[PDB]
Amino acid sequence: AVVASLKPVGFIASAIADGVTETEVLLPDGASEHDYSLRPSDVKRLQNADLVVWVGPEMEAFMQKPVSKLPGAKQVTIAQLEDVKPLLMKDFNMHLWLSPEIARATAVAIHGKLVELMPQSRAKLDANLKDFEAQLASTETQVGNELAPLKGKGYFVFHDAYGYFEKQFGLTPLGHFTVNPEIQPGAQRLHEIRTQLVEQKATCVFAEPQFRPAVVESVARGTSVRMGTLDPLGTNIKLGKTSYSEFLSQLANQYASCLK
Ligand SMILES: [Zn+2]
């Protein structure tokens, strides 16, 4: 199997590995990449993986050690890909699985590695990469269209996970409650967010399923601000050939459900 650190990385891997090998995901649904320790059974999967795929040590630091022990031919470290370095945005935001362009680079790297590891599967791997890129292009056209009328509407997200996606599709967030969703915002920060929401005529605040939404709801009350929910880890999406496109589509729907 290809073992992916986080579900959306698993989504990309599962487009490319479909009908070639299985894809497994380390981080369970409901858990957060900002607050995780590997289980003994997580450590097992890694040593036995045909290929490991992760963002890198500035993201999933809990994986750096066992990953450093593997051969280079048995890993893809997304944030260190030569194609990815030029695309990193300000040091750098590591929420890379939400960048369609980084997703392509990641697909390419996975394809290359699997072609080496599994030469019998070259044709299917080639076809998979082809299909992935076609589907992604359609998805980007669709998502761009869905989000176009929402450009300029201000909102707050719970944590700073969405930058690549927002930049690609022209969404205009006013800010985030937290950088690390592990760190409690503080009351001062919370009334300041509300002032900004009210003053700058924001339309939404967004909770996330991995974190209790109490604080998001508290900031909204009194105001005209609607509450939505964004899931940066695609919990409700099953791994599979079309999962990545489904993920980007669902995220777009989550923004639109509130912002429209
Ligand atoms: Zn995050």
Author numbering: 27 to 116, 139 to 308
Quoted passage from the original study:
The periplasmic ligand binding proteins (PLBPs) recognize diverse ligands and deliver their cargo to membrane-bound members of the ABC-type family for selective uptake into the cytoplasm.
The asymmetric unit is composed two protomers of ZnuA (molecules A and B; 520 residues), and includes two zinc ions and 527 water molecules. Zinc is coordinated by residues His60, His143, His207 and a water molecule. Intriguingly, however, ZnuA-Ec possesses a unique disulfide bond (Cys252–Cys306) in an unexpected location, between strand G and helix h. Instead, we propose a “partial domain slippage” mechanism which stems from small yet significant conformational changes in multiple locations of ZnuA, which together potentially drive binding and release of zinc. In this light, we assign the present ZnuA-Ec complex with zinc as the metal “bound” state while other previous structures like ZnuA-Syn may represent initial conformational steps of the metal “release” state.
